[PDB]
Amino acid sequence: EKYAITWTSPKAQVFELPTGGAATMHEGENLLYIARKEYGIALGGQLRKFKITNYKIYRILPSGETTFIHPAD
């Protein structure tokens, strides 16, 4: 696994997974393990129509290192 993306949702609603297909986010903090960073921004723009701008893409190395790479601040 690599590049975890987390976001906080106000409620539950059906979104579209970048890997193809539709899932249902929880209310509160979510977590999705994707393959590449290109999925997380293509998902992060799909959150923008849900009025969510609190998404954080990590970088999970196989050693266990999790590097916060989006945003920079």
């Binding site: 609603q13 059906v14 979104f15 579209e16 970048p18 890997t19 193809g20 297909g21 539709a22 249902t24 393959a35 290109e38 999925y39 293509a42 998902l43 723009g45 799909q46």
Partner: protein, 739 residues
């Protein structure tokens, strides 16, 4: 529940003046020549404008009256051209010798040589569309019945064109009139199909089959009475069809066996015409009609009783498929492309079934007699059926981009094919590869074994059998069905399975088609070229919204060229481009179906019967040992049968000689668009705009090269046009000479 808006759109010539009024971006005026092509491209795309489904649906229903007018103008034109400019009254006296002809050519530039002698003192182009078989099958005897039909068609073409004005510019329906799909299916299955075939069943019994029975006796053409005298003078419906004096009461006392003279179940071909029995078609379209009027009482309307489609689909769900068919009602009652994908992949697949069910069971008088007609009716509706299946695949990919909704389509069977779409494609990728080696490589095996002088190592009828056991068996069941599993028949459903040879004059109407080793290979070539076509079209449907390469492909659109040179290169990733690649394989698949047809029927069906019953075929019976090698498909089919199309100068087949070469040109011309790219041609125009800037002939609308998507679209339209027209001009000039 009819609610209709009153005058939405004013009828005016205002918007005819400015072009491209429909789109807000495109109406501001042209700046380059890109605007000229986007006007003709975004023209009949009514969905891009608004989100108002009520406003779009009124444009769609009114334009559908526009296409009904141009079909009726076309159809009444073919009757009118067959009324004046034809030899229909000389064809009825001798269909065995007089060739079907219309379209007399004006004599100006020496093209009067195209008006060749077809027989009957008449000079014109020998038609192959088979309208003389239809008009005799309708029972038309003289020219005046063709005039009043064609003049009647021109009136009926005017009512469709008036109602298209009326139901849009004057009285347009609301939205909820369109979404009464339970109320639509009840009227369209009963009144259109059921009552249409019940009324036509009344036309064979009272009119057509009395005339076609007097024709088979060989009485005359003029001496046969007018078909309204068959209704008045009932004594002529009792000389023929003796089960008619009992009248109307055996219908209502359930004495339906009284009607056994003119609602028969003969089950075979008429030995005089080589067509179907007219009494069997009468009992067909009547029994067709009862089933449709019953089954159109199914769906619920204003009176409570009836099924509901939102309650049929949501019950059918299983353990494997989760919520099942729950949610597919809202896809098919809101989106117009979901309807257009469904009504076109299943009407295009229907058209191919019509082509197979008309060469073996010729439904018209003297249809199987004319080899030139029967070859061309098959090969016509083959191509018409194949374009629509690609269109159903096209407008399904458009559904996935614009009209797909995640909220409705949650965990239903549409959602569950996008989870395992990698398992669908990669298991389909294997079968396309598996069928590629084990069907085409058995031709490459046979090419090499015959070239190496090893004929005993080939997959032929002599050396290594590959006999089609599962289709030789089904022919033996359909041969033995009269007396057995269908005792009421006499001969089989057709003579293509078994039975005997039915000769009409000298020419074979239908002979039992024997399947062998060459027929095993070519039916598995067909399964190969169809599964590959499905592979390309379904990949454009499943990967329409995203893939592992592009996670946001639906953000870009249905029709975009690429996503740049990165990721190795992402050109032709769109859902449009998989429709583009499937048009070639559709062309590839259907060209072999019409080549299998045009050489199996000539080698093993068609020909002349001698006195003792010996059947002398056209090509002498060489499909068996030559349709197993690619040399044999080149020598004995493409090379040997083209000796009538290229030797046809100075004769009436000269236009097929010119369309044979002229279509080789347009095919080769299309490769300039397919192979090259846009960015070359934009650079070249910059050096031609310079010489146009120098002499002050600089155009205000700037020249641009064709766009990336359009350069592909021009290159496939000129490809399919020249490739089919080659075959169009090759089938005609071969079969208008040996037939």
């Amino acid at each position: 529940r009819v609610i209709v808006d009153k005058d939405p759109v004013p009828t005016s010539f205002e918007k005819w003046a400015q072009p491209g009024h429909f789109d807000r971006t495109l109406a501001r005026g042209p700046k380059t020549t890109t605007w000229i092509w986007n006007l003709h491209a975004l023209a009949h795309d009514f969905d891009t404008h608004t989100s108002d489904l009520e406003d779009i649906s009124r444009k769609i229903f009114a334009a559908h009256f526009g296409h009904l007018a141009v079909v009726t103008i076309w159809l009444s034109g073919m009757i009118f051209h067959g009324a004046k400019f034809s030899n229909y009254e000389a064809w009825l006296s001798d269909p065995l010798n007089v060739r079907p002809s219309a379209q007399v050519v004006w004599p100006i530039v020496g093209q009067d040589i195209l008006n060749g002698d077809v027989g009957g003192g008449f000079h014109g182009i020998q038609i192959t569309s088979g309208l003389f078989q239809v008009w005799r099958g309708w029972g038309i005897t003289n020219s005046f019945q063709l005039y009043c039909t064609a003049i009647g068609g021109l009136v009926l073409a005017g009512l469709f064109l008036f109602a298209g004005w009326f139901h849009y510019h004057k009285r347009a329906p609301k939205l909820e009139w369109f979404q009464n799909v339970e109320s639509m299916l009840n009227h369209h299955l009963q009144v259109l199909l059921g009552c249409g075939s019940l009324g036509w069943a009344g036309h064979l019994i009272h009119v057509s089959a009395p005339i076609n029975k007097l024709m088979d006796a060989g009485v005359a053409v003029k001496d046969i009475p007018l078909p309204h005298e068959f209704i008045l003078n009932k004594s002529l419906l009792i000389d023929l069809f003796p089960g008619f004096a009992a009248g109307l009461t055996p219908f209502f006392t359930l004495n339906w066996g009284q009607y056994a003279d003119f609602l028969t179940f003969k089950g075979g071909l008429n030995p005089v015409t080589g067509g179907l029995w007219m009494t069997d078609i009468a009992h067909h379209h009547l029994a067709i009609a009862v089933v449709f009027i019953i089954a159109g009482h199914q769906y619920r309307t204003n009176w409570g009783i009836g099924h509901s489609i939102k309650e049929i689909l949501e019950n059918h769900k299983g353990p494997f498929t989760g919520e099942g068919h729950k949610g597919l009602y809202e896809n098919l009652t809101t989106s117009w492309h979901a309807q257009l994908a469904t009504n076109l992949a299943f009407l295009g697949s229907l058209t191919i079934i019509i082509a197979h069910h008309m060469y073996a069971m010729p439904p018209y008088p003297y249809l199987a007699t004319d080899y030139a007609t029967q070859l061309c009716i098959f090969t016509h509706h083959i191509w018409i059926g194949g374009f629509l299946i690609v269109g159903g695949a096209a407008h399904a990919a458009i559904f996935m981009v614009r009209d797909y909704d995640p909220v409705v389509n949650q965990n239903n069977v549409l959602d569950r094919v996008i989870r395992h779409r990698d398992a669908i494609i990669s298991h389909l990728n294997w079968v396309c590869i598996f069928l590629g080696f084990h069907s085409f490589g058995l031709y490459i095996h046979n090419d090499t074994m015959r070239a190496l002088g090893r004929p005993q190592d080939m997959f032929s009828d002599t050396a290594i059998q590959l006999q089609p056991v599962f289709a030789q068996w089904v022919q033996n069941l359909h041969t033995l069905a009269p007396g057995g599993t269908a005792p009421n028949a006499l001969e089989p459903v057709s003579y293509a399975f078994g039975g005997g040879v039915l000769a009409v004059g000298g020419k074979v109407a239908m002979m039992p088609i024997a399947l062998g080793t060459a027929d095993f290979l070519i039916h598995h070539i067909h399964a190969f070229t169809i599964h590959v076509t499905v592979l390309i079209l379904l990949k454009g449907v499943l990967f329409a919204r995203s893939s592992r390469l592009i996670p946001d492909k639906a953000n870009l659109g249905f029709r975009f060229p690429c996503d740049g040179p990165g990721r190795g290169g992402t050109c032709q990733v769109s859902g449009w481009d998989h429709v583009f690649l499937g048009l070639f394989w559709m062309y590839n698949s259907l060209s072999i179906v019409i080549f299998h047809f045009s050489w199996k029927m000539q080698s093993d069906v068609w020909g002349t019967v001698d006195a003792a019953g010996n059947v002398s075929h056209i090509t002498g019976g060489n499909f068996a040992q030559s349709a197993i090698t690619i040399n044999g498909w080149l020598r004995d089919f493409l090379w040997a049968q083209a000796s009538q199309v290229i030797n046809s100068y100075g004769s009436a087949l000269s236009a097929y000689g010119l369309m044979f070469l002229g279509a080789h040109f347009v095919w080769a011309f299309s490769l300039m668009f397919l192979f090259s790219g846009r960015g070359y041609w934009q650079e070249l125009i910059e050096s031609i705009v310079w010489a146009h800037n120098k002499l002050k002939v600089a155009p205000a609308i700037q020249p641009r090269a064709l766009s990336i998507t359009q350069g592909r679209a021009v290159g496939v339209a000129h490809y399919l046009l020249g490739g089919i027209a080659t075959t169009w001009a090759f089938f005609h000039a071969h079969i208008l000479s040996v037939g």
